[PDB]
Structures are given as C-alpha cells and as structure tokens.
Amino acid sequence: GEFADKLNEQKIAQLEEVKQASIKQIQDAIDMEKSQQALVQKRHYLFDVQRNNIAMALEVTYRER
Amino acid sequence: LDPVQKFVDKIREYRTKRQTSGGPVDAGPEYQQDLDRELFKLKQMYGKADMNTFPNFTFEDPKFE
C-alpha cells in the first residue's frame, strides 16, 4: 500500500520541482532579454547626452562671441 | 513789476560770451584739470582701449563643466 504513497509523493515532488525550475528558467530567459534590450537603445543615450552637450556649448559660445 | 522786465541785461552778457571764439572763455588752468579728471573717470567706466579705434578680438575657447 505504502509502495504507492512514497512513490507517488516522490513522483509529485518531482514535477513540483520540474514546474518550479521551469518557471525559474523562463523567468531567466526573460531577465536576460531585458538586460539585452537595455544595453541596446539604452546605452547610446549616454553618449548622445555628451554629444548634445558639446553641440550646445559651441552654440552658446558662437552666440556669446 | 513793469520795471522788472528790462531780461535785456542777461541777454547782452550771454551775447558777449557766445561771441567769443578761443576755447572756453576766460580759461583758468583748472578747466583742463577738471576736464582731464572727468576724462579719466570715463576711461574707468568704458575701458582702457583706444576709443578712436575699431576693436581687436581674440575669443575664448568654449568651457565645459
């Protein structure tokens, strides 16, 4: 009788870790993708701020002259 | 006011002054001194350049903070 219960509870326990892993991994495929998307567009802006800053600073300078 | 009118006497003296061409009438060395003094304050106000001349320009490089 017990033969089943231990095995069964074993068998469930498994798919319980299986569903778990599975969520946790796909959440990670997810994070990775956000990391990427960010490094994409995202990062250029830093340099864009910088280039913009220059452009302005020359204009102000020209005008001031 | 009627006697008060008799302006005449002032004009005449205006007239003899105005009729005089040889600098400012009855010089007195002070005139130049005062002149020079005020001529100096204006230098202070307007700057140490030759106001008879068109200005030089060397422009500042831009500045970044």
From Swiss-Prot, chain A:
- The protein's gene is named ATP5PB
Residues with the N6-succinyllysine modification: K11
- Similarity section: Belongs to the eukaryotic ATPase B chain family.
Q: Where in the cell is it found?
A: Mitochondrion; Mitochondrion inner membrane
Q: What is the lineage of its organism?
A: Eukaryota, Metazoa, Chordata, Craniata, Vertebrata
Q: Which proteins does it associate with, and in what oligomeric form?
A: Component of the ATP synthase complex composed at least of ATP5F1A/subunit alpha, ATP5F1B/subunit beta, ATP5MC1/subunit c (homooctomer), MT-ATP6/subunit a, MT-ATP8/subunit 8, ATP5ME/subunit e, ATP5MF/subunit f, ATP5MG/subunit g, ATP5MK/subunit k, ATP5MJ/subunit j, ATP5F1C/subunit gamma, ATP5F1D/subunit delta, ATP5F1E/subunit epsilon, ATP5PF/subunit F6, ATP5PB/subunit b, ATP5PD/subunit d, ATP5PO/subunit OSCP.
Q: What is this protein's name?
A: ATP synthase peripheral stalk subunit b, mitochondrial
Residues carrying N6-acetyllysine: K19, K34, K42
Q: Which domain of life is it from?
A: Eukaryota
**What is the role of the protein in this entry?**
Subunit b, of the mitochondrial membrane ATP synthase complex (F(1)F(0) ATP synthase or Complex V) that produces ATP from ADP in the presence of a proton gradient across the membrane which is generated by electron transport complexes of the respiratory chain. ATP synthase complex consist of a soluble F(1) head domain - the catalytic core - and a membrane F(1) domain - the membrane proton channel. These two domains are linked by a central stalk rotating inside the F(1) region and a stationary peripheral stalk.
- Specify the species: Bos taurus (Bovine)
UniProtKB/Swiss-Prot annotation, chain B:
Compartment list: Mitochondrion; Mitochondrion inner membrane
Has UniProt tagged this entry with the keyword Ion transport?
yes
Positions carrying N6-acetyllysine are: K6, K10, K43, K48, K63
Where N6-succinyllysine occurs, the residues are K48, K63
Keywords attached to this Swiss-Prot or TrEMBL record, sorted alphabetically, are: Acetylation, CF(0), Hydrogen ion transport, Ion transport, Membrane, Mitochondrion, Mitochondrion inner membrane, Phosphoprotein, Transit peptide, Transport
Q: Name one GO cellular component term.
A: mitochondrial inner membrane
Covered residues, full protein = 36 to 101 of 108
Q: Which family does it belong to?
A: Belongs to the eukaryotic ATPase subunit F6 family.
Q: What is this protein called?
A: ATP synthase peripheral stalk subunit F6, mitochondrial
- What processes in GO biological process is this protein linked to? proton motive force-driven ATP synthesis
Domain of life where this protein originates = Eukaryota
